[PDB]
Design a protein around this nucleic acid. Structure first.
Ligand SMILES: [Mg+2]
Ligand SMILES: [Zn+2]
Lengths: 226, 84, 1113, 94, 170, 165, 34, 57
DNA sequence: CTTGACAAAAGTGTTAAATTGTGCTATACTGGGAGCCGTCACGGATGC
DNA sequence: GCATCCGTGAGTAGAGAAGCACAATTTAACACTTTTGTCAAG
């Protein structure tokens, strides 16, 4: 009377969005599977983020730089959009140096290349410099999971360095849907659709595989009593 | 009822196809004998006057037509459900 | 499980017998047990003494005494054989020869009197029936002001209903007082001349009221003698009729003076004396003695009318809706009234047989034909509006039905004549008629309920009890007193603080003629017995009634009547204290008659050894089908050898738990929206309710079939049904009836019956088809009884009644009748209606598995999820307080009695919640568990909503939420807590008789009407849905012309169209163009029957035949 | 909502003309067994059935999608009724 | 009174689309019986329409393949839902029926205001438009998703209410 | 309890009176259908943007919902020039047009709006498309063939029971 | 039981014909070739 | 309807009011076969008047 | 194919009982019976 | 002009007590050939 094994179908477009359908499932197992994966996807997938920024002649985050349209906050907001992928597993922290002179539209590609460091979005806009404006940055990129506010980590490399909220999670959004499906005379079956948005550093398929593996590993912890 | 009226029409169309497998005079004998044309059973003498034959002549063609329809029904099974 | 009782008001007297309005009135009418010589002149005894002696004149038929015999059959046998539970009636009559001087005495059999059962109902033709009490205007003399003429008043004299004409006395604008009788207006001066009044007498009695007596002065009628005025009056009343003196005197005697034709009634006579300050000798407007008419009431009526018009002190108008002016006709009076009508018809037939002659050998048996009396009695108990099919869904349902008061019925009001005045809650309804229990809709205010402590007196007026207060101290003396007597006293409220028996509050809330006043204790003369006397039984079963809006309390009281008995029925956690009395007074449960020991306990019967030593065996009603189909069974509640005291419960009846009324279940309720499944009163339940068989009810359906004599041959009930296989006949026994214990589904045969086919030649297509298969057509056809669609269950009983059986009175031509009972165990499903006692009702829209339901931190899932949006607009806060008290009792393992208006209050509920928290949370501490991370998050939000005090420990904040009835609740789907604390508690919810199983219906094609050829109506007839004018309007507004035309023609009454539509669809073809409806053809023919030439014409005005040439000669 | 219902309403002056066109086209499709359709094979409406993907049996669904393509001509007094029925049988004997 | 009509208690269909209603299978089998008999004959369920009707007469003789054939019948088709009293034309609306287990009709929450319908025991009548005109009229003119504004005032009549407002407000 | 019973009795009698009124409205307007695009009439009504007020004895701007109930979806009978915007003759008034008219009324540039109405329609056995205006359910001009008479009767009769009576 | 003169039953839309271009052109050529 | 917050377009009422003003009463028959005080539809009398004007009656 | 032959099956002409229709009872009898009015406003006529 | 009686109308579903004589007409039980229906002959 046990249900047949479900079929895992994938609908992945590009490298930043994908839909994954598992059907048919026993009654209630769409919720049983969807929620744990969503919690892991939004908090546990390893990733990289900007955790500290140093800008010359800048004292606090709520100031501005003469010679650029964007104030410190807007550039910090643009830096939180930066997606970077480490090509070395042993690599833990890098610093990216940016020296640009106006009149220039500073992009993510203007960052100095670092060995085994890949900028996934080199077209990301950073700042717009007018003539005579000098922009010197040293941004610190760490490795982590989930979302860490700047105050809860407070990472500063040098004096006057501004901690920035670290969006470590490569997954940008998870939405799972459970629909009623049938197989013959059984009508309480579940159809689970998992939709994952990712920044592109990892595939939504890879994020799902990592989330499943994390949940599998935690299930092995219910062994060796006491 | 609409159901009763419909099954009457379905029975007529199935019988008309079953009688098509018969001959020309042979099918018309059953139609005239059972009253499928006028609505009344025509006696053998009345049927015999129409085709210019004796009474016992119809009984030969009428019964032989009956036997062949039984054979067709056993092979096609298209009239059994119309009697229950 | 302990029961904690709230309340401060001590009830000096208990509730009266809740069925005494039925039981006592019928006992008084029958007087079966009192010996004949001591029978009082009431009831049917009064009916005999009024119609007899039947003096034709000279033969006189006198009545000596009557007696009622034992019923021929027991109550259970009457139900099985469709018999009336009745007692034979014998009257000892004597025939007196005035000339010869010889008396012939014999006992004549007058028929059968239906008998009331112990619980207060009747078995009429095997069906349980309740005679609903009727309210109407009391007879007497009334003085209402003229709305057309300010300052003018009209005097109304009302006799008993259908016992005389209404009399109106009015001072006309010209001055003369006018008497209106039988729609004829004539001057009242003429009548007083007939009744022997002189000009000097009228001036002496009524000359002291202005010049109004001058209008009562016509010199023409004072000149004529009373005998001449009597003929003069007869001409006005009956113009054209020859005015002979003997004919004239008989008409006036029969109009105002004949006791057998005019009856003011005991209540009417008493009201007349009280209002007019006189003493009536009888119950007629006048008395005929010494060959002349003597006045009895017209002079006091006119004297009061002039005094009221003159504005003298002590004279007032009469409120006709005042409950002292409205009386109740109970079952005894209603039956007696119809008994008198039948006896009058019997007396008339006695006179004509006396006119026939043959007096040499005339006996009272020969003169008396009892059939007119039996027919009138049979008509009352069968076809009267007040005689109603007994509502016995649950024992409370039958109790309410027997206490119903109806303003409708014969001699009653109609909804057209029912204005706001009759339907409003008059101030005198207080303590007598419940201001809440009423049917919402067109019958609002027209059908009411007797108040819990109220009782109907001999005159028919409802009296309510009050405690006598003297010297500011409240005594135990209880006075039952009418509305008119109540208006004379200052009556304090039952909640007035008492120090012992003395009123302690300096300011006392009281009523004076229904108005709320603040008085000193020394001004208080009476006190209310209890808050319960204001309301009826159903309303008194609603806890925290004071916190519910009246409109929603109406719904709660009404829906308790609709609750179905449950196999695991539970008494509510929060009760009002009347649950025991309802079960006890319904006679549905079984109690020990006196002290004794139980000898035998079985599911069928209980045997108790009483102290005196006699063995009493009580058969138990088991799986009995009520009028509504709910299973009524009694389950024993004692063991062998158990000692029982007098009145101890022996067996619970339907919807009862240990003697307490159990109309539903006690379930864990979370008050919160849930994913739209709570939308607009919809209810979410857990699957755990189904697992433990809560809200599971047993329902029994009865199926009947008759084998008849037919001209072509008798129908045979047999197992040999032609053209049916062994699978269809598998469950039938050798007699053709389905075996007991078989499961039957829609389309299954309950009993096989063959009927001889009508002689008709077959269609030629069938003739050829039968000839091919070599099968000779049989002489009988399938007419067996089958399970209707959507029904079925388990066969539990087959009743077979045959012609010639003792007591079985089959109709002629019926050889036998077979009845099959099918029982189904119904679990709660989507579409079933649930309700609580506070008017919150809804259908189950979603059944969730246990892991999906919200659950407590200890893992306990809730049972029911209710939408909080149903509370604020309905303003029924009693359910919230019930939920809070239920939450405390759930963890303290105890139940509560909180009487209405005197019971559990918020401070005392919260201190119960404080103790319930110590087992709710203190048990967690002992188990080695602190505060959940999820609880900490909810507490953090809770202080942002102002629900908990900032700075306290999580335990203290959780206790603060608990004292508000709220807990931290976890979502079973996610495990995350609900962001705000949720009110969770235990509430009593009922499963109502409206079930989607009995209401779902569909039809493609089916039976059609005879004349209109349109589909029949009703699920029982497999009918189609009614597409009325408003639905036609909707399609017209949509422009859906073709959709409208199909419903008008193709799907209702286009005979050619509907046949062609069905044939086209089953061939995969589209339905053809519709044609003229057959109802229009009926309309045209019916218009021709009215000699109207209705013709359908074309563009060129030429006639168009819509009858296909079938009606053209 | 029906797919392209806004576009369907925009192609007719009266919303009830659209219903007449759709219904008349549907019966044309039913009369000729959908052999007179203007839809390309990849444009045919489909039914998901346990035995596989099949053509949609509802001609009203077919008619609405045909009108969205623009290959249908509707109007009053376009062709005689008798000539329309006869000619369409010649092209699609069915 | 009309043929091809039914009636049942209504419950909320929160998961339904605006153009959808939950129709019980047992109701739909009776409502669409003449269409189902033709569909059963096209498949191998029954040899002819008359034997197909005999199959549906007895509940215990109904095979599971009949329910599969019923789905193909109702594809693209709509039914009419009506709750008395029909005060205005939105008292009748067209919905594509979704076959549901149970005996209750599932009604969309957003059409309840137009019907003046709640879920405390209201019942609704179901009607089946038969021909192509009738189906086209219901699908185009009477569909619930095509009637969103009040004909009386022009304001949105199928609009958020009750829990929908409360959740969005919160 | 007196008021609760009184309100329930009022509701019971109001449903019958409301249902009777709707049936009378249906039977007097059932023949009114949009039968043509334009009847060709030049007659119209002027919807007032102001109403007299007795407490001040002056003209006060009417409520916005009241102006919308008389102007929304109505065809302009004459050209209107308000706030530099030319509202041409024959223009169907959208909700934005109504609000523009209210804004112009508050500026003192207009007091009344000439609109085509069923009252001045010359169509026999019904109304024309221009005199009726918009199909409210569709926020667009009414389609020829709609039984606006039935719609009007239902529109008036449907809230009949919601009246306090 | 007639088609009401409103909506789809109104004379303004009831007589509308629907035809495909293939059938329309076939009718066009038939007139020209005759 | 304003007092109860019910929003109803004026044109629905105007359709009914149009039907309430559909009939007229003849005050002077003129050169027609009508009777003074006869009640008839306004559309008929105007159409009848146009025929009379077309003939000079 | 006819042509006899049969035993029904059906039609048909009597005759009987069963059913149905009609007339007739001679003291004198000579104008009925049941109702019996708690709603409201609305036309529309019909006369003071 | 006005007062009065009459006639009209007042929500939708569903779910539920004569008897007898005799004649006159009809029914039904018979018989009868009459006509099929048929099963053997060539
Ligand atoms: Mg409801
Ligand atoms: Zn116009």
């Amino acid at each position: 009377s046990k249900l047949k094994a479900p079929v895992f179908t994938v609908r992945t477009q590009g490298r930043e969005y994908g839909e994954f359908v598992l059907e048919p499932l026993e009654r209630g197992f769409g919720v049983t599977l969807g929620n744990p994966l969503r919690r892991i996807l939004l908090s546990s997938i390893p990733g990289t983020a900007v955790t500290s920024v140093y800008i010359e002649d800048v004292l606090h985050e709520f100031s501005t730089i003469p010679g650029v349209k964007e104030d410190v906050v807007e550039i910090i907001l643009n830096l939180k959009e930066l997606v970077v992928r480490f090509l070395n597993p042993s690599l833990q922290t890098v610093t990216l140096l940016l020296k640009a002179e106006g009149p220039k539209e500073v992009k993510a590609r203007d960052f100095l290349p670092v060995a085994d460091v890949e900028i996934m979005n080199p077209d990301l806009h950073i700042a717009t410099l007018e003539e005579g404006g000098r922009l010197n940055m040293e941004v610190r990129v760490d490795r982590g999971v989930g979302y860490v506010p700047a105050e809860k980590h407070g990472i500063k490399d040098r004096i006057n360095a501004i901690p920035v909220d670290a969006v470590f999670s490569p997954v940008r959004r998870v939405a799972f849907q459970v629909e009623d499906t049938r197989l013959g005379q059984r009508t309480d079956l579940d159809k689970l659709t998992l939709r994952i948005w990712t920044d592109g550093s990892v595939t939504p398929l890879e994020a799902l595989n990592q989330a499943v593996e994390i949940l599998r590993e935690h299930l092995t912890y219910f062994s060796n009593p006491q | 009822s609409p159901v009763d009226a419909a099954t009457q029409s379905l029975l007529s169309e199935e019988l008309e196809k079953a009688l098509s497998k018969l001959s020309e005079r042979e099918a018309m004998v059953l139609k005239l004998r059972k009253g499928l044309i006028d609505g009344r059973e025509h006696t053998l003498e009345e049927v015999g006057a129409f085709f210019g034959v004796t009474r016992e002549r119809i009984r030969q063609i009428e019964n032989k037509a009956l036997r062949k329809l039984k054979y067709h029904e056993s092979r096609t099974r298209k009239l059994r459900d119309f009697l229950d | 499980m302990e029961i904690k009782r709230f309340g401060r008001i001590r009830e000096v007297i208990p509730l009266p017998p809740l069925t005494e309005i039925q039981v006592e009135s019928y006992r008084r009418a029958l007087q079966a047990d009192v010996p004949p010589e001591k029978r009082e002149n009431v009831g049917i005894q009064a009916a005999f003494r009024e119609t007899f002696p039947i003096e034709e004149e000279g033969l006189v038929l006198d009545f000596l005494e009557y007696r009622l015999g034992e019923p021929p059959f027991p109550q259970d046998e009457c139900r099985e054989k469709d018999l009336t539970y009745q007692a034979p009636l014998y009257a000892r009559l004597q025939l007196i020869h005035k000339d010869t001087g010889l008396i012939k005495e014999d006992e004549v059999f007058l028929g059968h009197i239906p008998l009331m059962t112990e619980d207060g109902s009747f078995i009429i033709n095997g069906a349980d029936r309740v005679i609903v009490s009727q309210i109407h205007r009391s007879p007497g003399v009334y003085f209402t002001p003229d709305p057309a003429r300010p300052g003018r008043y009209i005097a109304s004299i009302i006799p008993l209903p259908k016992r005389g004409p209404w009399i109106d006395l009015e001072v006309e604008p010209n001055g003369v007082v006018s008497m209106k009788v039988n729609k004829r207006k004539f001057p009242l001066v003429l009548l007083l001349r007939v009744l022997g009044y002189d000009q000097e007498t009228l001036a002496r009695e009524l000359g002291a009221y202005g010049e109004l007596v001058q209008g009562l002065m016509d010199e023409s009628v004072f000149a004529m003698r009373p005998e001449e005025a009597l003929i003069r009056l007869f001409t006005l009343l009956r113009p054209g009729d020859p005015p002979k003196r003997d004919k004239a005197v008989a008409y006036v005697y029969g109009l105002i003076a004949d006791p057998r034709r005019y009856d003011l009634g005991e209540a009417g006579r008493y009201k007349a004396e009280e209002k007019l300050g006189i003493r009536l000798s009888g119950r007629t407007l006048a008395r005929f003695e010494d060959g002349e008419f003597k006045d009895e009431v017209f002079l006091p009526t006119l004297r009061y009318l002039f005094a009221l018009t003159a504005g003298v002190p002590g004279h007032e108008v009469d409120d006709i809706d005042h409950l002292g002016n409205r009386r109740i006709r109970t079952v005894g009076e209603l039956m007696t009234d119809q008994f008198r009508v039948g006896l009058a018809r019997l007396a008339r037939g006695v006179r004509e047989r006396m006119l026939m002659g043959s007096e040499d050998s005339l006996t009272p048996a020969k003169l008396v034909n009892s059939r007119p009396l039996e027919a009138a009695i049979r008509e009352f108990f069968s076809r009267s509006q007040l005689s109603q099919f007994k509502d016995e869904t649950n024992p409370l349902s039958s109790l309410r039905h027997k206490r119903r008061i109806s303003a409708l019925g014969p001699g009653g009001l109609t909804r057209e004549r029912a204005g706001f005045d009759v339907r409003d809650v008059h101030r005198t309804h207080y303590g007598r008629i419940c201001p809440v229990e009423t049917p919402e809709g067109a019958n609002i205010g027209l059908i009411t309920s007797l108040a819990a402590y109220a009782r109907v007196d001999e005159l028919g007026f409802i009296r309510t009890p009050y405690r006598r207060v003297v010297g500011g101290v409240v005594t135990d003396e209880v006075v039952y007193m009418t509305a008119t007597e109540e208006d004379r006293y200052t009556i304090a409220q039952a909640n007035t603080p008492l120090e012992g028996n003395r009123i302690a509050a300096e300011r006392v809330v009281a009523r004076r003629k229904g108005e709320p006043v603040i008085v000193s204790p020394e001004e208080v003369e009476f006190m209310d017995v209890s808050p319960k006397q204001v309301f009826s039984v159903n309303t008194n079963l609603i806890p925290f009634l004071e916190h519910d809006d009246a409109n929603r309390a109406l719904m709660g009281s009404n829906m308790q009547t609709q609750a179905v008995p449950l196999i695991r029925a539970q008494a509510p956690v929060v009760m009002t204290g009347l649950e025991e009395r309802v079960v006890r007074d319904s006679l549905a449960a079984l109690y020990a008659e006196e002290d004794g020991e139980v000898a035998k306990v079985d599911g069928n019967r209980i045997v108790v050894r009483y102290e005196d030593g006699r063995l009493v065996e009580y058969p138990l009603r088991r799986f009995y089908r009520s009028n509504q189909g709910t299973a009524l069974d009694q389950r024993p509640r004692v063991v062998v050898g158990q000692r029982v005291r007098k009145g101890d419960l022996l067996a619970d009846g339907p919807a009862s738990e240990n003697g307490f009324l159990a109309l539903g279940q006690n379930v864990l309720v979370a008050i919160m929206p849930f994913d739209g499944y709570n939308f607009e009163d919809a209810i979410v339940i857990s699957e755990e309710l189904l697992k433990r068989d809560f809200y599971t009810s047993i329902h029994i359906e009865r199926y009947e079939i008759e084998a008849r004599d037919t001209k072509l041959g008798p129908e045979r009930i047999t197992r040999d049904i032609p053209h049916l296989s062994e699978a269809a006949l598998r469950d039938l026994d050798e007699e053709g009836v389905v075996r007991i214990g078989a499961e039957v589904k829609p389309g299954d045969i309950l009993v096989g019956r063959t009927s001889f086919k009508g002689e008709s030649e077959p269609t030629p297509e069938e003739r050829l088809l039968r000839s091919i298969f070599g099968e000779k057509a049989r002489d009988v056809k399938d007419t067996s009884l089958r399970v209707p669609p959507g029904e079925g269950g388990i066969v539990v009983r087959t009743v077979r009644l045959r012609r010639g059986d003792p007591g079985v009175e089959l109709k002629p031509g019926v050889r036998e009748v077979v009845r099959v009972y099918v029982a189904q165990k119904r679990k709660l499903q989507v579409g079933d209606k649930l309700a609580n006692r506070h008017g919150n009702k809804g259908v189950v829209a979603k059944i969730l598995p246990v892991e999906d339901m919200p659950h407590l931190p200890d893992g306990t899932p809730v049972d029911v999820i209710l939408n909080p949006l149903g509370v604020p607009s309905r303003m029924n806060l009693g359910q919230i307080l019930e939920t809070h008290l239920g939450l405390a009792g759930y963890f303290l393992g105890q139940r509560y009695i909180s009487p209405i208006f005197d019971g559990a209050k918020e401070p005392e509920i919260k201190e119960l919640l404080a103790q319930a928290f110590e087992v709710y949370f203190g048990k967690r501490k002992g188990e080695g568990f602190g505060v959940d991370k999820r609880e900490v998050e909810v507490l953090r939000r809770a202080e942002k909503l102002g629900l908990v005090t900032p700075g306290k420990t999580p335990e203290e904040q959780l206790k603060e939420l608990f004292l508000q009835g709220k807990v931290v609740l976890y979502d079973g789907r996610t495990g995350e807590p609900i962001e705000g604390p949720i009110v969770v508690g235990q509430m009593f919810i009922m499963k109502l008789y409206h079930m989607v199983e009995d209401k779902m219906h569909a039809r493609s094609t089916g039976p059609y009407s005879l004349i209109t050829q349109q589909p029949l109506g009703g699920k029982a007839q497999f009918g189609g849905q009614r597409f009325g004018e408003m639905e036609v309007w909707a399609l017209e507004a949509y422009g859906a012309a073709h959709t409208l035309q199909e419903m008008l023609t193709l799907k209702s009454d286009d005979i050619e169209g509907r046949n062609a539509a069905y044939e086209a669809i089953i061939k995969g073809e589209d339905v053809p163009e519709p044609s003229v409806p057959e109802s229009f053809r009926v309309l045209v023919k019916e218009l021709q029957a009215l000699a109207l030439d209705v013709q359908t014409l074309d563009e060129k005005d030429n006639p168009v035949d819509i009858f296909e040439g079938l009606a053209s000669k | 909502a029906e797919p392209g219902i806004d576009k369907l309403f925009g192609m007719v002056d009266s919303k009830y003309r659209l219903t007449v066109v759709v219904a008349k086209r549907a019966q044309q499709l039913l009369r000729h067994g959908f052999k007179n359709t203007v839809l390309e094979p990849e444009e045919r409406p489909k039914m998901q059935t346990l035995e596989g993907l099949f053509d949609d049996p509802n001609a009203v669904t077919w008619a609405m999608k045909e009108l969205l393509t623009g290959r249908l001509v509707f109007g009053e007094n376009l062709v005689p009724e008798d000539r329309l029925q006869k000619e369409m049988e010649r092209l699609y004997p069915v | 009174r009309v043929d091809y009509s039914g009636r049942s208690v209504i419950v909320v269909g929160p998961q339904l689309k605006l153009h959808q209603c939950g129709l019980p299978k047992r109701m739909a089998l009776e409502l669409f019986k003449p269409f189902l008999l033709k569909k059963m004959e096209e498949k191998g369920i029954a040899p002819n329409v008359k034997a197909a009707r005999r199959m549906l007469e007895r509940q215990r003789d109904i095979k599971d393949e009949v329910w599969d054939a019923l789905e193909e019948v109702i594809h693209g088709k709509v039914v009419l839902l009506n709750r008395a009293p029909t005060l205005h034309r939105l008292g009748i609306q067209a919905f594509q029926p979704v076959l549901v287990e149970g005996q209750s009709i599932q009604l969309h929450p957003l059409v309840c205001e137009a019907f003046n319908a709640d879920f405390d025991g209201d019942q609704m009548a179901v009607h089946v438009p038969l021909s192509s005109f009738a189906q086209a009229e219901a699908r185009i003119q009477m569909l619930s998703a095509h009637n969103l504004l009040s004909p009386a005032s022009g304001e949105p009549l199928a609009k958020p209410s009750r829990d929908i407002i409360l959740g969005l407000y919160y | 309890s007196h008021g609760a019973r009184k309100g329930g009795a009022d509701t019971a009698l109001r449903t019958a009176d409301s249902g009777y009124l709707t049936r009378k409205l249906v039977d007097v307007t059932h023949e009114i259908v949009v039968r043509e695009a334009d009847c060709g009439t030049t007659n119209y009504i002027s919807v007032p943007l102001f109403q007299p007020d007795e407490v001040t004895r002056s003209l006060r701007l009417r409520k916005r919902a009241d102006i919308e109930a008389g102007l929304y979806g109505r065809v302009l009978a004459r050209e209107v020039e308000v706030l530099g915007v030319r509202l041409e003759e024959g223009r169907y008034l959208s909700m934005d047009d109504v609000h523009l008219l209210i804004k112009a009324a508050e500026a003192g540039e207009i007091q009344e709006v000439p609109v085509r109405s069923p009252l001045t329609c010359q169509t026999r056995y019904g109304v024309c498309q221009k005199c009726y205006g918009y199909d409210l359910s569709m926020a667009r001009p009414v389609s020829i063939g709609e039984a606006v008479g039935i719609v009007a009767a239902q529109s008036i009769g449907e809230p009949g029971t919601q009246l306090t009576m | 039981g007639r088609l009401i003169p409103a909506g789809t039953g109104s004379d303004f839309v009831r007589f509308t014909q629907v035809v495909d271009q293939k059938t329309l052109k076939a009718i066009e050529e038939a007139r020209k070739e005759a | 309807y304003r007092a109860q917050g019910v929003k109803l377009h004026d044109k629905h009422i105007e359709i009914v009011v149009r039907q309430m003003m559909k009939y007229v009463e003849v005050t002077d028959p003129g050169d027609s076969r009508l009777l003074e005080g006869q009640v008839l539809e306004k559309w008929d009398v105007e159409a009848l008047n146009e025929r009379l004007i077309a003939e000079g009656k």
